[PDB]
Amino acid sequence: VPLDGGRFATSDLNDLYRRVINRNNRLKRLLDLAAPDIIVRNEKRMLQEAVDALLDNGRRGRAITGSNKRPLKSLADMIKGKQGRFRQNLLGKRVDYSGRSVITVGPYLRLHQCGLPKKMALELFKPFIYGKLELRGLATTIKAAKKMVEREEAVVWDILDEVIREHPVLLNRAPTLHRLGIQAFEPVLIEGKAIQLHPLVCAAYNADFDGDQMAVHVPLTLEAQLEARALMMSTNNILSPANGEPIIVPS
Amino acid sequence: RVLDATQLYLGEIGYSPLLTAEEEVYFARRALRGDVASRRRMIESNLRLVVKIARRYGNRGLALLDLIEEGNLGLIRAVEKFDPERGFRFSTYATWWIRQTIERAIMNQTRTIRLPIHIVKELNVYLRTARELSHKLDHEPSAEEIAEQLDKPVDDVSRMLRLNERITSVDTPLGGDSEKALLDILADEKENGPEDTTQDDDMKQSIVKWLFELNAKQREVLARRFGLLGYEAATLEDVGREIGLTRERVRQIQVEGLRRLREILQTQGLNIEALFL
Amino acid sequence: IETPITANFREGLNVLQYFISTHGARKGLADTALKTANSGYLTRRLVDVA
Amino acid sequence: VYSYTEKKRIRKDFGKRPQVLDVPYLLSIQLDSFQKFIEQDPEGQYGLEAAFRSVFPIQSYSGNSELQYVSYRLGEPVFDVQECQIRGVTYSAPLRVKLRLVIYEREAPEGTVKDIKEQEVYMGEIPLMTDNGTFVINGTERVIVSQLHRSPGVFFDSDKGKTHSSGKVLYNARIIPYRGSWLDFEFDPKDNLFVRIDRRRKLPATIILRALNYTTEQILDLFFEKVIFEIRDNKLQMELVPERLRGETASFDIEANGKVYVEKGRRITARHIRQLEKDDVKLIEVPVEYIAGKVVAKDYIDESTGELICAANMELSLDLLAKLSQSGHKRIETLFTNDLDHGPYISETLRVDPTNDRLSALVEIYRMMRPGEPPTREAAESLFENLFFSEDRYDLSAVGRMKFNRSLLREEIEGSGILSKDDIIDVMKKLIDIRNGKGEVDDIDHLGNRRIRSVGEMAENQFRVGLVRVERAVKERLSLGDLDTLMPQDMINAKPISAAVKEFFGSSQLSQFMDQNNPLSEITHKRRISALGPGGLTRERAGFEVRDVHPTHYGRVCPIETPEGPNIGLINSLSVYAQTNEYGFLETPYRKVTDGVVTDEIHYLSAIEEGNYVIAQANSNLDEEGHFVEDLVTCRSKGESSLFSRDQVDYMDVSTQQVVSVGASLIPFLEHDDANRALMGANMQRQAVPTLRADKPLVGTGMERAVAVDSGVTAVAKRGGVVQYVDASRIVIKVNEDEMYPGEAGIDIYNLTKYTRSNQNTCINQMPCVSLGEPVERGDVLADGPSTDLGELALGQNMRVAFMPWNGYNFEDSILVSERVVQEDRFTTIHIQELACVSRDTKLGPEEITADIPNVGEAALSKLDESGIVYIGAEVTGGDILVGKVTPKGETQLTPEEKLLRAIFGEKASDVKDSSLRVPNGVSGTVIDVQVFTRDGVEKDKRALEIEEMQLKQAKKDLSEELQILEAGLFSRIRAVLVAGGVEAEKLDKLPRDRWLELGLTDEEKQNQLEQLAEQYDELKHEFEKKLEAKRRKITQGDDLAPGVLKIVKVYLAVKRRIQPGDKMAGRHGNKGVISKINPIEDMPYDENGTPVDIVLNPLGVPSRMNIGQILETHLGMAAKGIGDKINAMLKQQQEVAKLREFIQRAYDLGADVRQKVDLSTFSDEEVMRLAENLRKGMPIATPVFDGAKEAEIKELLKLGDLPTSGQIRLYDGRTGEQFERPVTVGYMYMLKLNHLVDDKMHARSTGSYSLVTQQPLGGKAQFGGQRFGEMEVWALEAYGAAYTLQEMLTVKSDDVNGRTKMYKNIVDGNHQMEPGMPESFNVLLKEIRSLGINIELEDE
DNA sequence: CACGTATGCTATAATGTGGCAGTCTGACGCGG
DNA sequence: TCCGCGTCAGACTCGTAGGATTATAGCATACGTGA
Ligand SMILES: Nc1nc2c(ncn2[C@@H]2O[C@H](COP(=O)(O)OP(=O)(O)OP(=O)(O)O)[C@@H](O)[C@H]2O)c(=O)[nH]1
Ligand SMILES: [Mg+2]
Predict the structure, then answer these.
(1) In a 3-state reduction of DSSP, which class is residue D644?
(2) Ligand 2 centroid, distance to D1104 Cα (angstroms)
(3) d(CA A178, CA A237)
């Protein structure tokens, strides 16, 4: 692909495939030319070296260094490592309708609630706004609804308030050691950029407000909303899964 | 424990015969007439020559072995077009061929994108000029400074230095250690975001509803022209192929369809709202 | 260490008491950075098995 | 005796220990080191001189041609730091080197009388270090961090068990050169000595001695002692050495003369030994059976046959003894090997050694490094000599040879860089001594073995690499070419050297963006030591032992300043007084104690020197101008601490502060803080963003002023004198005649840097400290930098703080702040962002920067001017266009919708796109500045041209004012010289100054002075002309940009950020917090006096944290402000200068045993009221580190303020008006707003762009990224029920392409149904496994 | 034909290669 | 069976910043597709 700078950027698999093709075609040539066998042998060694580098570089001894000096990333390297494709792109992923910010106390909150910044929530529930806007006939179409949100018009806040009502949001803190590292809350729209967390659940998250941050995630489907409200809600996860002793307790 | 492809091959080469002058002449006459053994022996005996130039041709593009193999291709052509009738020695003639084939391979296989030797040769002169300029101008060559020295076009010099830019690895990370790779920063552009794709689904859907809102003869020549409903995007004069068969009446009716549709966008709440877009 | 720190934080530790404290402190902090990963590797082996 | 800037505001000192040595320049390391690299020394191989003489002269392979080095020179820098920073170029000097191509005849033997060609060739630009200690690389200020590595020399180490559950301690020697292969010796469980060359495969240690040409008998004569056996008549005899037996058990009855000394089977004690020695025992009769096992030393052969009866190093028997006797040998040299002390190690190693002679040994060594390749004798000799005995490939360095020689107990320090045969044997000897039990193992963590490489050494090494790459090219071209046409510059290439150095100063790990949040951040960054990067440890490699603070770190490295992270213990801040010895070891100052009396004689001791002496502690009480008060002084030696008598004491700690680094020295009551919290405190001070009003710290230490001055961010007066002209831009000082040189005009101009961008986008602003017409001395602060008060370092703002709960608004470290803080714009912070717009040339054609942009509102284009550039001063918000840019589009094919749409508005707008630079979404600011970089050939923008008009006229004005103020200042001197011996006061002023070339006086010294001033005037006249032509050329000059790029427009935005909930604040005792709420003034707890508290911090975040420093700071802070409130009250009521003087003298001279005396009196009345006006906003106090203020001193100070001794007050709740039920601690804590603003961290995403291969959303807020849903987070949903939430997160939220769009459409349609698919990551996985040649199919239902 | 891209040919003799890895570490197998 | 190189492992999100280098001769004859 072309970078903006006019330059190109490519996978190392291209360099490994080009190795293999050059040496393979040179082998075809030296066979057509009836070359003496010492030279044929050298080319057959080099061909096996190139294929073995292409499949799994570094297993067959010294890995082929590209441009920096770093060994070229081969096929097997894209599957194998923790960074491969299993651990990185398949047993966990980056996710839509996800946000984060610094957390801060919400002592006024009830146990099942959390302060969610206005501008953050505006963005996370964009399709839900578009949808209600068109059912009220306030927006003629989607692009007009988008421009009404961009302008952040006063009527849009009232609609956003209506969507967030009774809609649970997942809060997550790293590290997620046990299941209570994710909990669902009913959000409360707040002016300001910080997430407000209920004190009593700070124990489960191991949350202390000296700058910790949290991930927000929006359960989209009716099923996901119900699983959040019934199974993952703060109120419903009072006792720990490990011992019977509860974790929800003020200090 | 000799496992290395290189040390094995260099062991095999050392294990050859070294040729003399009269021996080169005897073998060369037999070789050009078409001897099997003469060709093999001349090649195998002169492999050492390939290596000595191949060793002084590394760290540029390919590896030592890669250069050694392409250099060997030069040796073969050298044995084929060697003239034993000329009193002058083989080693001198072969050196040309080995250097030629190595250089040519280094100009092709190295550059990821196949580049022509014509542009490469021009580039060489631009770079050599830059070297001489750098020694006298303590700074480095400008494109314009180089262009003035060769009496050539600034544009042509810039085009050339634009093909010199090396390609960067996407698999290689940037964030200090291994935090993120260039792949994960760089998004798929030809692919639209779901917000953009959904916006087009709404326009296309609106058009179907907009087609059943105007006149039956006003959306039969407005859409069959743009290729909205039709199969082919026709022009004012080409709408005559269907049933319209007019030039004046088609142009009046196209714009009549658009004027009534402009009022449909002013009333729904777009017009100047959707003008910025 | 054979000589204990008789002085406390209220009274103020001497240059030597503070320097001696450092060892334990930093080993604690390095422990949190480095040892967290064997604990976590055990979580992950357990999870995969069950 | 106080300086002018101290007369304005004096800090009260609670220190009691008189400082014999002042804090040195804190940025000494960076400057000294790099200065050595560029420094031209004829002899002293340092940096470049060394580099050239090392490589050069390079002679050709043929030997006819050679290139030799003469000398080098740095051209002056093409661009100043200023122009480099703006343009984005490296600040460097061109390196021009004189080189002589000399050629020899092949026909004559070594006739040098053929061709000598000498010329000055360019080899790269070298980046230059700034006066501050930084490099500007591609327009960015960077610091190269000093490195900490294993010193070359020898090290004797030992696996303490590890290998072999046998649990055997295997001793090893490692010889580490500065350059070359490593030489290892090691023991095996079976006590066989082995050599690893370059840590390759194992070889028997004796093999290396055979390679050095040692016969078997010579080897044994080296390691083993000889014992002589005489065979007399029939009985066996042996020559006894009285001691040898010693602690052995007697195996035979030992009879001497005729009389029995030992009983057989009893242990020989000291009495037997002295009896035998005094009797002079030399022969003892022994049984023949005792020799079975003894090792013969030499080869013994039959003189009759001439054949070998027994070879050297062979185990003797009864029959070999018999054969030896009858051959005619009645003397047998045998080895001494008695287990325990004298082990037979080398004896057993020779039996393991398969090699025989020298050649066989050299072959085996050759076969190890190059296995397979056949030996030749020439090849094996060459390889072995080129390993450790070649001057070019092996170099211990001065430090290596020195540490090597001291480790082997030599007398001579200096010597050869190459290993001698003697060296290797001595090392083996010491190894074996250590195995025996006499001699000890060296420490790797010991600072005596860890050496510091600052910049100059590292720049030197990269420069040598460049030269080595060049040497191959050069030698290659010298041999091939004809010698006579060919000059030296056609052979040299500059690009290799330039590339080596460029890669160091730009790509290197140790070269990193200067941490410029604040002065302390900068100063501490430049004095960093890293064990990481090239030639060092890695995070993988780094254990637990290296990371921990050793006892040698005392006075050299800070024990309490290290990143809390993966880098914990590898990165270290330098101590205060610490410095590098000549060889690069760290050293610390100590006061010599002579005959018990403690002199002011000060000695810097290295890590190794320190171990040897007993050093008293700094807190040790000295008696009034002589010896120690106390009999048993508390000291430290041999790395451990206890009581000593006075006569034993050798030395003493110079300051109480020398243990600590700079950052930690700024923490007041460090003594009362846990070391962990203190670490994070020193770490967060570096994160402190300077506020709009730089407020001094009320509770300081005294390092405040040192740091502010040495950081360089303050303008300091070199010359002093009286200030001629102040301005919010410049300070001109007229110098005093005593420092003012009579050559040039004596007027100093300091130009101040106004509101400029930092690397962290903070604001750098210099304001003038002094007023118009103020007298100043050398080293007075003339202008304050960003986070500095009158000369002192001011990282944040002190505040009235009360420790008490609020309604959970301070739950877990959460902070409750008064609205008054926001109103007073305290912790309001200034941020300057740099945005660039690049006009490139594409295959379709050049991009245009016109205001003429397709599909754009008049609202947007209003703010752009003719060229398409936003106006200076214009406020902008996300989506507003800053620089309009359009890109040529090739294919114009449209979807039918777009054909219709473009037909409706008729806004065809040709075929141009919109790629305009617009304000990033949610950032909003004012445009402060615009810069345009254009190429040479292309027609300039209208806006670019008006910018050049401004720069030209402004340049003209700048230079004109230079020549004007310089001419006025110069004639003002001529006027004074002419009066000297020629009274013409009023008569000289009336005729024009321009017609003063005629004016002279009689030929004396004064006429020569007039000539100096006249030649300078005209020199300045032409100088002004050539300066102006240079400026004009640079302004017209079209800058050479990246290929493809026609022009670049840089916009600078300014932003005022207010303090707000989510923002991170901390103190200096590692006490952090996030602001939870801003309380109305009415609501905040208030005093009996009615004054509301600024910040309400939670009491529960103190006793657990064990940082009690913050509480002492608060009590003293209130006492400081108590006295400020008294002075404020006396200044409001005018009152008497006498009365103010009384109160203030009693105040400064309070402390029980205050070191600092302040005999107020000498202060003039005007000095006193300027001083009181500064002391009014709270008397600033200094608590040194470990010599701080005592509780009793703080309570005494509180009584002087009429504040309570408890420092707790009655508080009233702002809401209810009722009193709080118990007293609350209130006072002033100096607080810091860290760089972590909520403004920068909040991020949210519904849908966005998606990754190239994996199709998952991108990461990071800059890429508008989705949060990563990790394995850990997935497992949580697995533990719950939540299967749909999980599938969502896997599929329509990430890869599933069809699914995500379909579900988006459903959510706008309000269906809230998933319709899942197949994740694209999995499709890729399949393709990647099939690319391996494994068939992986989906099997259908 | 022509521009871009490629293959071609040259003659003093010359004829066996060579830049790093810095020893992480406990763990668990697979040849001699 | 045992000493030993070999091979496989080493918490979770956030950030920052962009990125490099070298040189391959002069010339003519040649093969390939669009006008
Ligand atoms: N997950 C994670 N947590 C960290 C890391 N570094 C520090 N922490 C957490 O930061 C917190 C800092 O101290 P606190 O949580 O306030 O400690 P505490 O258990 O409340 O005890 P006190 O300080 O006495 O109140 C701890 O919970 C740590 O677990 C890290 O690298 N990863
Ligand atoms: Mg806590």
Answers:
(1) strand
(2) 9
(3) 12
- CB of A175 sitting under 6 A from ligand 1: yes
Do D250 and D292 belong together in one domain? yes
For D549, the closest of C3, C14, C23 (CB atoms) is C23
Please answer whether residues D1131 and D1247 qualify as being in contact, where contact means their C-beta atoms are separated by less than 8 angstroms.
no
**D1095 and D1225 share one domain:** yes
With a CB cutoff of 8 Å and minimum separation 6, the contacts of B148 are: none
Neighbours of chain A (3+ CB pairs under 8 A): B, D
* Residue ranges of the binding site of A for Mg(2+): 208, 210, 212
The count of domains in chain D is 9
Q: How far is CA D1142 from CA D432, D441, D777, D1134, D1149, in A?
A: 76, 65, 28, 15, 11
Task: Look at residue D1089 and tell me if it is in a domain.
Answer: yes
- Does B275 lie at the interface with A, CB-CB under 8 angstroms? no
Are residues D707 and D719 both part of a single domain?
A: no
Count CB-CB contacts under 10 A for residue D819. 16
Q: Are residues D1033 and D1162 in the same domain?
A: no
Cβ-defined contact of D896 to B228 (cutoff 8 Å): yes
D1140 and D1261: one domain? no
Q: How far apart are the C-alpha atoms of D770 and D889, rounded to whole Å?
A: 59
**Measured between alpha carbons, how far apart are the two ends of chain A, in Å?**
56
Using the atom order of ligand 1, give the atom closest to the CA of residue D564. 6
Contact by Cβ (8 Å): B187, D1258 = yes
Q: Is the dihedral of CA B267, B268, B269, B274 positive or negative?
A: negative
Query: Quick one: which H or E segment has residue B192?
Result: none
Report yes or no: D291 and D334 within 8 Å, Cβ to Cβ: yes
| Contact indicator for D262, D253 with CB cutoff of 8 Å | yes
Report the chain B residue with the minimal C-alpha distance to residue D508. B176
Helix (H) or strand (E) holding A95: none
Going by their DSSP bridges, the two strands A98-105 and D1243-1245 should be labelled as antiparallel
Within 7 Å: CB of B59 and strand E?
yes
Distance from chain centroid for Cα B76: 30
Dist. CA D1086–CA B120, nearest whole Å = 81
CB D693 within 8 A of CB D825: yes
Task: Give the residue from D1011, D1027, D1057 where a domain finishes.
Answer: D1057
Q: Based on the fold, state whether residues D625 and D666 are members of the same structural domain.
A: no
Distance of CA B33 to the CA centre of its chain: 43
CA pair distance A211, A204, nearest whole angstrom: 17
Q: Provide the token pair at D347.
A: 């004896």
Q: Which of D811, D1098, D1104, D1110 to probe ligand 1 with, by most ligand atoms within 8 A of CB? A: D1104
Token pair, residue D456, equals 């100059």
Could you say which of D342, D364, D398 is where a domain stops? D342
Which protein residue has the closest C-alpha to ligand 1 atom 25? D1104
Asked if residues D126 and D501 have their Cβ atoms less than 8 Å apart, the reply is yes
Q: Looking at the partner chain, which of C12, C15, C30 has a beta carbon nearest the beta carbon of D617?
A: C15
Location of structure tokens 């699914």: D1299
Which residue's structure tokens are 């912790």?
D827
> Rounded to the nearest whole angstrom, what is the distance from the C-alpha of residue A206 to the centroid of ligand 1?
8
Resolution in A: 3.9
Q: Using the atom order of ligand 1, give the atom closest to the CA of residue D565.
A: 31
> Are B168 and A7 inside 8 Å of each other by CB?
yes
E-state strands within A32-166 = 93-94, 98-105, 113-117
Residues D425 and D458 occupy one common structural domain: no
Range of the domain at D1067: 656-712+788-827+1058-1241
Chain gaps in chain A, named by the residue before each (C–N > 2.5 Å)? none
* Residues D917 and D846 both lie in one domain: yes
Q: Which helix (H) or strand (E) holds B31?
A: helix B21-33
Give yes or no for D679 touching C (CB within 8 A). yes
How many angstroms separate the CA atoms of D207 and D361, rounded? 5
The alpha carbon of D829 is separated from its chain's Cα centroid by a whole number of angstroms, namely 28
